[PDB]
Ligand binder design. Structure first.
Ligand SMILES: O=C(NCCc1c[nH]c2ccccc12)OC[C@H]1O[C@@H](n2cnc3c2ncn2ccnc32)[C@H](O)[C@@H]1O
Lengths: 115, 112
């Protein structure tokens, strides 16, 4: 299926409700249901890629697109004091959904280390 | 608006370089927050992700691809976390765009 089998595939296909921020032919941005900051959203590819470790060389511009859409959405949402973008890989990185996704967090001071 | 990362690109100060090509550089972070902690930066001086141009998408993606190939080469088979900080709330420490890659331990939630 277009978008894959994960929960994020179902969001892409409008089978499960989500609070969409932005959508184009390549990606979808929506608020996280378990926010860790005052603003916390995800940007995901519509093409299913399970995790960043298996991304193809030809997936470069798509991955870049996630970050451009992320920074544009942060702007549109009024994160003028800044934000943090996170991609997690595998067990050690902390991945509960195996569909590549960019976390964007802001509206408070983010601390170091980033987990 | 030169930065310390500009000096690193120009080879004017030491850094432990992992990988270089014509448009980016990966090197170990001087202040590591995990057993493995490196940066991937563009050679082009983009001050912060918030000012990246549309035309830069491919380059930003390249940082992530380079980062994931370096992680594999450094033996990070249990996973890793990639981070880009923007602005004071993001805790951006150097005004030259950089991708952090951290692994070699469990990374926690929230991510700061
Ligand atoms: O994979 C990850 N890793 C980060 C967290 C983590 C998990 N395991 C770890 C072990 C260690 C450290 C961190 C972690 O995050 C997936 C994200 O998807 C979010 N999410 C899941 N379902 C929906 C949704 N967001 C909107 N939705 C709308 C409708 N349905 C959903 C979820 O809240 C989470 O932040």
């Amino acid at each position: 299926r277009p978008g894959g089998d994960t929960i994020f595939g179902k969001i892409i296909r409008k089978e499960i409700p989500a609070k969409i921020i932005f959508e184009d032919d390549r990606c979808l941005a929506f608020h996280d249901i378990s926010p860790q900051a005052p603003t916390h959203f995800l940007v995901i590819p519509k093409k299913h890629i399970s995790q960043i470790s298996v991304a193809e060389d030809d997936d470069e511009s798509l991955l870049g697109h996630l970050m451009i859409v992320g920074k544009k959405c942060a702007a549109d949402l009024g994160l003028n004091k800044g934000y943090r973008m996170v991609v997690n890989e595998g067990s050690d990185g902390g991945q509960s959904v195996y569909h590549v996704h960019l976390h964007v967090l802001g509206g408070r001071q983010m601390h170091w280390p980033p987990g």
